[PDB]
C-alpha cells in the first residue's frame, strides 16, 4: 500500500522533530515573571 | 515555572544538569516539591493505567502488522517451511540488492522474519486467518482506549480513590487472586476447551457459533452428574495431526502427559485441564483474607504472633506490616523480586516443555525467547535488590523494627557478607583453576590430564524423574519403585517416553562440561547477590560514613578524605552489579545456545569434548558460529543478514562506548568543556548565538548512569544478531 | 573512666565503637567530651585518639598499681 | 482491614501463644483438639492410602470422597498444634 | 487480506486513543 | 559403572587416544636422528606418555564416551583417592598454614612493636609456629573450649545498624 | 546551596577554616570546647562542596559536615 | 568602598580571565598593598608584578581570590588583601575579612550559625521526615 | 462535559430536554414523576434483559411474539 510511503516519514521525522522543538521551548521558557 | 516544577531546585539550577536531573527524577514522585502520601498514590494508580494501555496497544499493534503484511495464512498450510513476516521493510536508504536480498517469505516486498513465536503462539491458541488477528487488534485497541479513559478519570476530584482504601490490603489480595489469577485462568481453560481444541481438531469455533457448537458431545452433563471421567475418555491418539480431524479425539480435559508427537508440543487437552485446575486452587486461596465479612484472616495479626519461641528470630515479625503497608519501596521490591524468578521460571521451562505447535523445530524463536527472557529475569533481580536497598535507606524504622527479623538481618550483616565474599571467592578460585588447568592439559597435548567431574546429583536428579541412560535405577527409573507404581496410570506412560526419547530438550544430558559451567554460575549468582546484599545493608552506614542515610541512595561521594569514598552510596552497588548481572546471563545463554546448537546439529561430542576448556569454548562457539553474521555484508554482496551484521558492530561501538564514561570521570570534562566555553564566547559571529543553560560536564551519577546504559545497550545489540543470526545461518 | 585506665568505646559512629582504648586526661569545668581516649588502631583519618564522653565509655580494666 | 482493627497477638516475651490466635477455635478444649486431630489424621492417611497406594490411582476412576479427607492430614497438623496451645492456655 | 477500509476505522479508533493519552498526559502533568 | 561410564582398561576411545599420542610422537621423530640428545629425549616423552597411560588404567579411573577420566565426587568410597583423600590432605594442609599464621599474629601482638613485627617476621619465632602448627585440630579444639578461639562479639566493631 | 553545619564535638582546631578556601568557615567563641571557640558556617551559600573542611576535621567522626544541595553559579564554580 | 583607580598589576594579558559573566552577573576584585614591586603567579595562568604600594585586581571567583590571598599570606606575607564582589549595577559587597580580622582568629562579635546541639550520629532517620519538607540535619 | 463538570447547579437526570412540563407541577409531584420514572427505567432494565435471552435461547417471547 501507500500507507508506509505516507506515515513513516511523517511519524519519523516530522512529528519527532516537532517534538523535540516543542519540548526545547518549553524547557528553556523562564519563569512568570 | 521552569521545566522541573516538580523540583524548585533543580529550576533554580542554572547549568545544563537542570535538563538532565528532572528527566531522571521525573518518576521519582516520593521525592518531589509539596508531595503527599495520597497524591502519590493517586498519581502511581493513574500511571499504572497508562502502562497497561501502552501494553495493550503494542500487542495490537504486532497483532495488526502480522495481519496486513504477514504471511500467517501461508504459514498456516506449512508451518515447518515458510518462514513467518513480522513486518514490511519501508527504507529509501536500501539498494536494490538490500531490496532484492530481503524480499523473502513468498512475498513480492522487504520483509523482517519474526523470531517471537507470535505466529506459533496464535496457530496453537487457534487463529487461522488475518480477519481474527485484525479483530483481536481491535479488540485490544478498544481495551487501550478504555484504560487511558481510565486511567485520565480516576484523577478526578470525585474519583480520586482515598489512601485507606489504596492501603486496603486484604481486599486487594483477596480480589488479585481469585478474579485476576484465578478466574482468568478459568477463562483461559473455557477459551482452550471451546476454540483451541476444537481448532487443533479441525472445527471452526468463532463467535457466531460458538454458542450452538458443544465443547463436548455429552455437554455439561458428565460435569453435573459427577462422571467427570467421561471428559478424559478418548484422548487424542498418537497419529494425530495438528488441526485436521483425522485421529482427532474428544477428550476435553485429560493427564496424557509427555507431548504431542506430530507437534512436539504438550497436548492442549493438558494445558486445558492445568489451567482449571489451578483457576479452582487460586479461586480457593483467594478467601483467605478477611474482607467485610467476619470470615478470613487479619494479616498484621498473623505476622506479630509468627515469632518462634525463647526469642529464636528476635521479635519474629512485629511490625513487618507496618513497614510494608507503609513503604511502597519493599512492595516494590518484593514484587519484582516474584517476577524475575517466575521470568526464569518461564525461561528455563518453555525450552524443557514446549506448549506451541512446531516452535520445537523453530530454533531461531526457541533461543531469542529464552535470550530474552533471561536477560529480563537479570533486569528484574537488580531491581528488587535496588529497591530493597532504597526501601533500607528511604523506608526502614528501627523504632518499629525493634529486634525484628528484619533489623537481624542488619545485625548479621558483617556475617553474611562475609560469608557470601567466602562462597564466591572458593567458587572463583576452584572453577577458574580447573579451567586453566583443563586449558593448560589440552594445549600441552595431554587432554588425559584434565579434571572432569561428572555432575553425579543432577544426573541422579534426572534418573529419579525418569532418565535411564544413567543406570542410577533410582525412583521412576526404578521399574518397581512405588512412585513409578502410583504414577504408572496417568501420566508416566507419556512422560516416561518424552523424557528418555533422544530428540528432546527435555532433561538434557549432562556431563563435566555442564559440572564446570553451572559452577561457574554459581559463582556468579553468588558474586552478583554479594554485591547486592552488601549495597542494601549498607546504604543505611558504614565504618565509613556511619551517616549515609542522611545524604541518601545516590550521591557521588563523601570526597577525598579518609583515604577516598568512590562509589559508596549503594546506587553504586547497583550499577556495579548490573555488571555482573550482565555477565552472568552472558555465561547461561552461551551455555544453552552452545549446548542446544551442538544437539541441534547433532553434534553433542563437540560440546562434550570441548567445552571443558576456555580455548574450546572461544573457538568452537563464536569463532566457528560468527561466520555467517560478520559474512552478512562482505566486498562480494550482500545477505539478509546484513541488518544483523551492522548491528553486531554498532552493539559493539555502544558497548566500547560505554567504556570512556566508565573510565574518564569529570574533571577532565569539566576543563575541556569550559576552553570549549572560551572558544565559543571568543569567536567571533559564532557569539552572537549564546546558550541559555551553562554548558557544564556531566555530573558522576549522570555519567555512571550513562555509561552503564551504553555498556548494557551493546551487550544486548552485540549478543541478539549474533544468537539469532548465526542460528538462522546454520538452521541448527 | 579515670587516667590510665582502659575503656571501651561505645559511641555507635566512632572507629572504636566496642574497642578498648587507654584514657589519656580527663579535662574538668567545661569538656563536653572530657575523657581523651588514645588508640593504638589509627582511623581511616590516621588519628590514633579522640575526645568521648563519660557515659560513652565503660570500664574494663582499672589502671595499674 | 485497618490497622486498627487487629488484636494484640504477638506473644514473643511468653513461652506459649494466647488463645486469640486460634480465631473461631479459641474457646475448642484441648481434649476436643487433640481427639479430632488424631481421628482427622487417620482418615486422611486412610484416603490417601485407599486413592494412590492400595489402588494406583486411575484417571478414569477417581472416587472424590478420598481426595476430600486427604486435606484433613495439613487439618490434623493443626489440630494439634492448636490442642497444645490449648493445653499451654489451660483452656 | 486486510482491506483499506479495515485499516482506516483501526487508524481512527488509534486517533481516539492518541486524543485519550493526550488528556490523561495532561491530567498527570497537572 | 556408575554413570553409564566404564573403566579406561576397556575403552576403546582411551586406547585409540594412546596410539594416537604415540603416533605423533613417533613423526615428529622423523626429523631427528639416532643417539642424539633431541632423539634420547623424544624416547623419554614417549614412555612417560605410555607410562601415564598405563597407570590411569591401573588405577580404575572411568572413561566416558570422550574417552578421558572422569572423577566422581559424591562420597563413595570405590572412588575415595579422586577426591576424599586429596581433601583431607589439602584441609590438613590448610588449616596447617593459617593456624601458623594465627599462632604467629597472637604473639605478634604481644610485642613491644606488632606494627614492625609484621613487615620484618621473626624467623626463629616463625618456624617455631610453623612447626608447632602439625597438631593444629587438637590445638584449636582445646582454644575453642577455653574460649580462646573466639573474640566475643561485643568486642569487635560492628557499624551502625 | 549546600547546607554546611557544625556539631558539638568540636575542638576548636580551627583546622577547618583554614583548609576552606572559600571563606565560608569561621570560628565564633563556645563554652563546651576546652579551646572556647566552635567553627561556624554563616556563608553557606559561598560553599562549593569540596569538603577540604571535612578532609581537614580530626575528629573520630567529623565535627564540620556538609550536604550537597540545590546547585547555583557559585556552588559549581562556574568562571562564565 | 572601593576606589576603582588603583593602579593595577603589570600583567601581559591571557586567556584565563572572565569570560562575558562577570560584566552581567558578577565580578570580583582584591586589593592588597606590598612593600616591594615583585612578581607573583596569578590565579589564571601567567605572571604579574604586583606594583609597590597599593594593588587591586579582578577575578571571576571567590575561590580564585581567596585562592591569590593564600598566595599573597604564605608567600609574600601580605596579609591586608581584602576581597569585594562587584555586581553589574556597581554595587560592590566587602566579603572576605569581614569583621577585620581573618576567620581562623576568633572574635566575640561572630554568632554561631549551622550550630547543632547534639553528635553527628543522633540525627533523625529519613523515614522521621518523609514526606515533610525539613531534612535530616 | 455536563457529566464530568463540576457544575454546582446541575441536578441528577437534568439535561433539559422536555423539562417544561415540570414546571407546572410541584416539588412533592416533581419528586413522585421523578420516582415514577426511576421504576419504570428499574423494571425496563430487568425486563429488557429477560427478552433478550428469551429471544437468545427459545427465539421467542411467551405471551407475545408467537413465532
Ligand atoms: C515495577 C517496576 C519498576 C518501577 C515501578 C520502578 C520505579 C522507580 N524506580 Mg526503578 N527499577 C526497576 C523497576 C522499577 N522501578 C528495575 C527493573 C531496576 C533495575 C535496573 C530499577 C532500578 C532502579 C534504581 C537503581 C533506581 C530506581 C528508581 C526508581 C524510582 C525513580 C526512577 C525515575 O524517576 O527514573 C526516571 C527516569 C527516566 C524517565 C529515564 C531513564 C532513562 C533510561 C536509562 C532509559 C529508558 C528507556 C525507555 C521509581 C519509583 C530510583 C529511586 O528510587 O531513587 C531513589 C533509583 O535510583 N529504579
Ligand atoms: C575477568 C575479570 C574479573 C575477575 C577475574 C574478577 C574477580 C573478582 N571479582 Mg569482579 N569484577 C569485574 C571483573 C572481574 N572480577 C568487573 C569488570 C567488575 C565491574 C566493575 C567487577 C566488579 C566486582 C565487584 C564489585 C566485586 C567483584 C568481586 C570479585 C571476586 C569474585 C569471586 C572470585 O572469583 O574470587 C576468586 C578470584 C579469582 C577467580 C581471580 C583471582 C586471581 C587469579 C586466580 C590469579 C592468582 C594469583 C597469581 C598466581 C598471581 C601471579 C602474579 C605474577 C574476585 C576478586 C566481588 C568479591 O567477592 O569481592 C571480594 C566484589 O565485591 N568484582
Ligand atoms: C512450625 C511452624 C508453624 C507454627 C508452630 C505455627 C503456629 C501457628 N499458626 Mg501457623 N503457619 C505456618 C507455620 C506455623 N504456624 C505456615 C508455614 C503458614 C503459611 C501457610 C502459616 C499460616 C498461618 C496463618 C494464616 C495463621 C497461622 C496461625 C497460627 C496459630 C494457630 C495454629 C492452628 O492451629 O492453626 C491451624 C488450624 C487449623 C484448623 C488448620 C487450618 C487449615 C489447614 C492447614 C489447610 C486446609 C486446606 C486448605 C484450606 C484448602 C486446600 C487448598 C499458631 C500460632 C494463626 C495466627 O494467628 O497466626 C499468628 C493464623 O491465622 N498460621
Ligand atoms: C497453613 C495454613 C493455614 C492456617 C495455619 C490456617 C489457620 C486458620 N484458619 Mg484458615 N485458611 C487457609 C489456610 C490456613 N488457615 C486457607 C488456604 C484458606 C482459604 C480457603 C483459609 C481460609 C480461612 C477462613 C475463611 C477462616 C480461616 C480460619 C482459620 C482459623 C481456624 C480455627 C479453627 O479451626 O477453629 C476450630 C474450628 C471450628 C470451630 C470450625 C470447624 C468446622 C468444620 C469442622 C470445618 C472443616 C473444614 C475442613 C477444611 C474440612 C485458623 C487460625 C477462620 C478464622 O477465624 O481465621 C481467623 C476463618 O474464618 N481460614
Ligand atoms: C472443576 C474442575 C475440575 C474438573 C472439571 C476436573 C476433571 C477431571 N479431573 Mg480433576 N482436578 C481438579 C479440578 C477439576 N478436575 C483440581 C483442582 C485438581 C487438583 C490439582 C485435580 C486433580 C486431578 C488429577 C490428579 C486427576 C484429575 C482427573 C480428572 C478427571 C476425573 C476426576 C473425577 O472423576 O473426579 C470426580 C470427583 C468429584 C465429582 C468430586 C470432587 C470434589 C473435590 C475433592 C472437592 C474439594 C476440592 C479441593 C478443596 C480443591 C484443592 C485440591 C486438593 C484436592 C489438593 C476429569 C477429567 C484425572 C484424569 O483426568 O486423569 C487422566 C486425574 O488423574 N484431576
Ligand atoms: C548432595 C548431597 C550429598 C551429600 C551431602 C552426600 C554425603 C555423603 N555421601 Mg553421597 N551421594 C549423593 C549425594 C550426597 N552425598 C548422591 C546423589 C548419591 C547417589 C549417586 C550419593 C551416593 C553415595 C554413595 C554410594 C556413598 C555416599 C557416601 C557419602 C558420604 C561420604 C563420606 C566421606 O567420604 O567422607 C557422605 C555422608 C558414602 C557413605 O555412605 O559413606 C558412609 C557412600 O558410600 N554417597
Ligand atoms: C420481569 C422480567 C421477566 C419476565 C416477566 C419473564 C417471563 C418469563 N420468562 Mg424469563 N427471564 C428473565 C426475566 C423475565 N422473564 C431474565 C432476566 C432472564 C435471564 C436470566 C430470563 C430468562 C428466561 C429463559 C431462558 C426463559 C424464560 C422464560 C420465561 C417464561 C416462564 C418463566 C416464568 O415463570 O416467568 C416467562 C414468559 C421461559 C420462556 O419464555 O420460554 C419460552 C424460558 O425458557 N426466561
Ligand atoms: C464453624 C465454621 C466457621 C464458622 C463461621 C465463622 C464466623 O462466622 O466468623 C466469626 C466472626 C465473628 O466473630 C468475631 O471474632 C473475632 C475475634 S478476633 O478479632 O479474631 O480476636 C472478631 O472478628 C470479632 O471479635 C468477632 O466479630 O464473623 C462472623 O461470625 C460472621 C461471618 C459468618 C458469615 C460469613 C461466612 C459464613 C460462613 C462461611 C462458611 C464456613 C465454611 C463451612
Ligand atoms: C421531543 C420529545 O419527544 O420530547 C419528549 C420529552 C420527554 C420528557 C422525554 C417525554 C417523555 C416521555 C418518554 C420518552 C416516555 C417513554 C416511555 C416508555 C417507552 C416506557 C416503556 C416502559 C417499559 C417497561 C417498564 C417494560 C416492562 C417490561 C416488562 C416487565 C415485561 O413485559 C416482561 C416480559 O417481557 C418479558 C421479560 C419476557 C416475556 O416472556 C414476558 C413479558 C412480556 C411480560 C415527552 C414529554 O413525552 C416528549
Ligand atoms: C483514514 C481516516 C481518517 C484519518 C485518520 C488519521 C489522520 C489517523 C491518524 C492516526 C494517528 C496519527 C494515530 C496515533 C496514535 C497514537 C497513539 C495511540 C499514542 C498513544 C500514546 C500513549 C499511550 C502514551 C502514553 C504516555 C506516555 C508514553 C508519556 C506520558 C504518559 C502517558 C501514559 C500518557 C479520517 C479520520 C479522516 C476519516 C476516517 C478514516
Ligand atoms: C534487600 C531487600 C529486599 C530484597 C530482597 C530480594 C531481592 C530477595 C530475593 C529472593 C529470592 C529471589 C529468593 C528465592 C528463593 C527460592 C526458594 C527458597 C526456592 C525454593 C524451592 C523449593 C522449596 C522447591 C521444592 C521442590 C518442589 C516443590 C518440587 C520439585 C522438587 C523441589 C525440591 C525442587 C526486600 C525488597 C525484601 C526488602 C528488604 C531488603
Redesign the pocket.
Same mark, same amino acid.
Given at each position: 500500500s501507500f500507507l508506509p510511503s505516507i506515515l513513516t516519514p511523517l511519524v519519523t521525522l516530522v512529528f519527532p522533530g516537532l517534538c523535540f522543538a516543542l519540548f526545547f521551548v518549553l524547557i528553556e521558557q523562564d519563569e512568570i515573571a | 515555572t521552569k521545566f522541573p516544577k516538580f523540583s524548585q531546585a533543580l529550576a533554580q539550577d542554572p547549568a545544563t544538569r537542570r535538563i538532565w536531573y528532572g528527566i531522571a527524577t521525573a518518576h521519582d514522585l516520593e521525592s518531589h516539591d509539596g508531595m503527599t502520601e495520597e497524591n502519590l498514590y493517586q498519581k502511581i494508580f493513574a500511571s499504572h493505567f497508562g502502562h497497561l494501555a501502552i501494553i495493550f496497544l503494542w500487542t495490537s499493534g504486532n497483532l495488526f502488522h502480522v495481519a496486513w503484511q504477514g504471511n500467517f495464512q501461508q504459514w498456516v498450510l506449512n508451518p515447518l517451511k515458510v518462514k513467518p513476516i513480522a513486518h514490511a521493510i519501508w527504507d529509501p536508504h536500501f539498494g536494490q540488492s538490500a531490496i532484492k536480498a530481503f524480499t523473502r517469505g513468498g512475498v513480492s516486498y522487504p520483509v523482517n522474519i519474526a523470531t517471537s513465536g507470535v505466529y506459533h503462539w496464535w496457530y496453537t491458541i487457534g487463529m487461522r486467518t488475518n480477519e481474527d488477528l485484525y479483530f483481536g487488534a481491535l479488540g485490544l485497541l478498544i481495551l487501550s482506549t478504555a484504560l487511558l479513559f481510565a486511567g485520565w478519570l480516576h484523577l478526578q476530584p470525585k474519583f480520586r480513590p482515598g489512601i485507606a482504601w489504596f492501603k486496603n490490603n486484604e481486599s486487594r489480595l483477596n480480589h488479585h487472586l481469585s478474579g485476576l489469577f484465578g478466574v482468568s485462568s478459568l477463562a483461559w481453560a473455557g477459551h482452550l476447551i471451546h476454540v483451541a481444541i476444537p481448532e487443533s481438531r479441525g472445527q471452526h469455533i468463532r463467535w457466531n457459533n460458538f454458542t450452538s457448537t458443544l465443547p463436548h458431545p455429552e455437554g455439561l452433563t458428565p460435569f453435573f452428574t459427577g462422571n467427570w471421567g467421561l471428559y478424559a475418555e478418548n484422548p487424542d491418539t498418537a497419529q494425530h495431526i495438528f488441526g485436521t480431524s483425522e485421529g482427532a479425539g474428544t477428550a476435553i480435559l485429560t493427564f496424557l502427559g509427555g507431548f504431542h508427537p506430530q507437534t512436539q508440543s504438550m497436548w492442549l487437552t493438558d494445558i486445558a485441564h492445568h489451567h482449571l485446575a489451578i483457576a479452582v486452587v487460586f479461586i480457593f486461596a483467594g478467601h483467605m483474607y478477611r474482607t467485610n465479612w467476619g470470615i478470613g484472616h487479619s494479616m498484621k495479626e498473623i505476622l506479630d504472633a509468627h515469632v518462634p519461641p525463647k526469642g529464636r528470630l528476635g521479635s519474629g515479625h512485629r511490625g513487618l506490616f507496618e513497614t510494608i503497608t507503609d513503604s511502597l519501596h519493599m512492595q516494590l521490591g518484593l514484587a519484582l523480586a516474584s517476577l524475575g524468578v517466575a521470568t526464569s521460571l518461564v525461561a528455563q521451562h518453555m525450552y524443557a516443555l514446549p506448549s506451541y505447535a512446531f516452535m520445537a523445530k523453530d530454533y531461531v524463536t526457541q533461543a531469542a525467547l529464552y535470550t530474552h527472557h533471561q536477560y529480563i529475569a537479570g533486569f528484574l533481580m537488580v531491581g528488587a535488590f535496588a529497591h530493597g536497598a532504597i526501601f533500607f535507606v528511604r523506608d526502614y524504622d528501627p523504632e518499629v523494627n525493634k529486634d525484628n527479623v528484619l533489623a537481624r538481618m542488619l545485625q548479621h550483616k558483617e556475617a553474611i557478607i562475609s560469608h557470601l &565474599?567466602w562462597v &564466591? #571467592?572458593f +567458587? *572463583? $578460585?576452584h572453577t #577458574? *583453576?580447573l579451567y586453566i588447568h583443563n586449558d593448560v592439559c589440552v594445549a600441552f597435548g595431554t587432554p588425559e590430564k584434565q579434571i572432569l567431574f561428572e555432575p553425579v546429583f543432577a544426573q541422579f536428579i534426572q534418573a529419579a524423574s525418569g532418565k535411564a541412560l544413567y543406570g542410577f535405577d533410582v525412583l521412576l527409573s526404578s521399574p518397581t519403585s512405588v512412585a513409578t507404581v502410583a504414577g504408572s496410570k496417568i501420566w508416566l506412560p507419556g512422560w516416561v517416553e518424552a523424557i528418555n526419547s533422544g530428540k528432546n530438550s527435555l532433561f538434557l544430558t549432562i556431563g563435566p562440561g555442564d559440572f564446570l559451567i553451572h559452577h561457574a554460575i554459581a +559463582?556468579a549468582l553468588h558474586?552478583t547477590t +554479594?554485591?547486592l546484599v552488601?549495597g542494601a545493608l549498607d546504604a543505611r552506614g558504614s565504618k565509613l560514613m556511619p551517616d549515609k542515610k542522611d545524604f541518601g541512595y545516590s550521591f557521588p561521594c563523601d570526597g577525598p578524605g579518609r583515604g577516598g569514598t568512590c562509589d559508596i552510596s549503594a546506587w553504586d552497588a547497583f550499577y #556495579?552489579?548490573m $555488571?555482573?548481572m550482565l555477565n552472568t546471563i552472558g555465561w547461561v545463554t552461551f551455555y544453552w545456545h552452545w549446548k542446544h546448537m551442538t544437539i541441534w546439529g547433532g553434534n553433542a561430542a563437540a560440546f562434550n569434548e570441548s567445552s571443558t576448556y576456555i580455548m574450546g569454548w572461544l573457538r568452537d562457539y563464536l569463532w566457528l558460529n560468527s561466520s555467517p553474521l560478520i559474512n552478512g555484508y562482505n566486498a562480494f554482496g550482500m545477505n539478509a543478514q546484513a541488518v544483523w551484521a551492522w548491528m553486531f558492530l554498532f552493539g559493539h561501538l555502544i558497548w566500547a562506548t560505554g567504556f570512556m564514561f566508565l573510565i574518564s570521570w569529570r574533571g577532565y570534562w569539566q576543563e575541556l568543556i569550559e576552553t570549549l566555553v572560551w572558544a565559543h564566547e571568543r569567536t567571533p559571529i559564532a557569539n552572537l548565538v549564546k546558550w541559555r543553560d551553562k554548558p557544564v560536564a556531566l555530573s558522576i551519577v549522570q555519567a555512571r548512569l550513562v555509561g552503564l546504559a551504553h555498556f548494557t545497550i551493546g551487550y544486548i545489540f552485540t549478543y541478539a544478531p549474533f544468537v539469532i543470526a548465526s542460528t538462522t545461518g546454520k538452521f541448527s | 573512666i579515670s587516667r590510665g585506665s582502659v575503656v571501651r568505646i561505645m559511641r555507635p559512629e566512632s572507629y572504636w565503637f566496642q574497642e578498648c582504648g587507654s584514657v589519656a586526661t580527663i579535662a574538668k569545668g567545661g569538656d563536653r567530651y572530657p575523657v581523651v581516649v588514645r588508640f593504638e588502631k589509627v582511623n581511616y583519618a590516621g588519628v590514633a585518639t579522640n575526645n568521648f564522653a563519660m557515659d560513652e565509655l565503660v570500664e574494663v580494666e582499672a589502671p595499674p598499681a | 482491614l485497618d490497622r486498627s482493627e487487629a488484636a494484640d497477638t504477638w506473644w514473643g516475651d511468653k513461652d506459649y501463644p494466647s488463645s486469640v490466635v486460634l480465631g473461631i477455635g479459641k474457646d475448642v478444649p484441648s481434649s476436643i483438639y487433640g481427639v479430632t486431630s488424631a481421628i482427622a489424621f487417620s482418615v486422611g492417611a486412610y484416603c490417601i492410602a485407599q486413592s494412590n497406594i492400595i489402588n494406583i490411582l486411575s484417571g478414569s476412576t477417581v472416587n472424590g470422597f478420598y481426595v476430600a479427607g486427604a486435606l484433613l492430614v495439613p487439618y490434623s497438623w493443626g489440630l494439634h498444634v492448636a490442642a497444645w496451645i490449648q493445653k499451654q492456655n489451660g483452656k | 487480506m486486510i482491506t483499506d477500509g479495515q485499516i482506516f476505522v483501526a487508524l481512527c479508533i488509534a486517533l481516539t486513543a492518541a486524543i485519550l493519552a493526550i488528556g490523561l498526559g495532561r491530567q498527570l502533568y497537572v | 559403572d556408575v554413570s553409564g561410564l566404564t573403566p579406561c582398561k576397556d575403552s576403546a576411545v582411551f586406547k585409540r587416544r594412546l596410539d594416537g599420542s604415540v603416533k605423533k610422537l613417533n613423526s615428529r621423530l622423523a626429523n631427528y636422528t639416532e643417539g642424539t640428545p633431541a632423539y634420547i629425549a623424544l624416547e623419554q616423552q614417549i614412555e612417560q606418555t605410555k607410562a601415564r597411560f598405563a597407570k590411569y588404567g591401573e588405577k580404575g579411573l572411568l572413561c566416558g564416551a570422550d574417552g578421558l577420566p572422569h572423577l566422581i565426587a559424591d562420597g563413595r568410597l570405590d572412588h575415595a583417592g579422586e577426591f576424599i583423600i586429596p581433601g583431607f590432605g589439602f584441609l590438613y594442609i590448610a588449616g596447617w598454614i593459617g593456624w601458623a599464621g594465627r599462632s604467629y599474629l597472637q604473639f605478634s601482638k604481644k610485642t613491644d612493636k606488632p606494627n614492625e613485627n609484621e613487615i620484618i617476621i621473626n624467623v626463629p619465632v616463625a618456624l617455631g609456629m610453623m612447626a608447632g602448627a602439625f597438631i593444629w585440630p587438637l590445638a584449636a579444639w582445646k582454644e575453642l573450649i577455653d574460649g580462646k578461639l573466639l573474640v566475643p562479639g561485643d568486642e569487635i566493631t560492628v557499624s551502625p545498624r | 546551596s549546600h547546607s554546611v553545619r557544625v556539631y558539638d564535638t568540636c575542638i576548636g582546631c580551627t583546622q577547618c577554616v583554614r583548609a576552606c578556601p572559600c571563606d565560608v568557615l569561621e570560628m565564633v567563641p563556645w563554652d563546651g570546647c576546652k579551646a572556647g571557640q566552635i567553627a561556624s558556617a554563616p556563608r553557606a551559600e559561598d560553599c562549593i562542596g569540596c569538603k577540604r573542611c571535612e578532609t581537614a576535621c580530626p575528629t573520630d567522626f567529623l565535627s564540620v559536615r556538609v550536604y550537597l544541595g540545590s546547585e547555583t553559579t557559585r556552588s559549581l564554580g562556574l568562571s562564565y | 568602598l572601593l576606589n576603582l583607580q588603583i593602579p593595577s598589576p603589570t600583567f601581559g594579558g591571557s586567556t584565563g580571565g572572565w569570560l562575558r559573566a562577570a560584566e552581567i552577573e558578577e565580578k570580583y576584585a582584591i586589593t592588597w598593598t606590598s612593600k616591594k614591586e615583585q612578581i607573583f603567579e596569578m590565579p589564571t595562568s601567567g605572571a604579574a608584578i604586583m606594583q609597590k604600594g597599593e594593588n587591586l585586581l579582578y577575578l571571576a571567583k571567590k575561590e580564585q581570590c581567596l585562592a591569590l590571598g593564600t598566595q599573597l599570606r604564605t608567600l609574600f606575607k601580605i596579609s591586608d588583601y581584602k576581597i569585594y564582589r562587584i555586581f553589574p549595577n556597581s554595587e560592590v559587597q566587602y566579603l572576605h575579612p569581614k569583621d577585620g580580622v581573618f576567620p581562623e582568629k576568633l572574635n566575640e562579635g561572630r554568632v554561631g550559625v549551622g550550630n547543632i546541639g547534639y553528635s553527628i550520629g543522633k540525627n533523625p532517620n529519613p523515614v522521621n521526615v518523609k514526606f515533610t519538607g525539613k531534612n535530616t540535619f | 462535559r455536563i457529566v464530568f463538570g463540576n457544575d454546582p447547579n446541575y441536578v441528577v437526570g437534568d439535561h433539559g430536554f422536555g423539562s417544561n412540563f415540570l414546571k407546572g407541577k410541584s416539588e412533592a409531584q416533581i419528586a413522585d414523576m421523578k420516582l415514577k420514572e426511576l421504576n419504570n427505567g428499574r423494571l425496563a432494565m430487568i425486563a429488557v434483559t429477560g427478552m433478550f435471552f428469551q429471544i437468545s435461547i427459545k427465539g421467542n417471547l411467551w405471551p407475545i411474539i408467537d413465532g
Open positions: - | &565474599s &564466591s #571467592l +567458587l *572463583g $578460585f #577458574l *583453576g +559463582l558474586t +554479594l554485591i552488601k #556495579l552489579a $555488571f555482573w | - | - | - | - | - | - | -
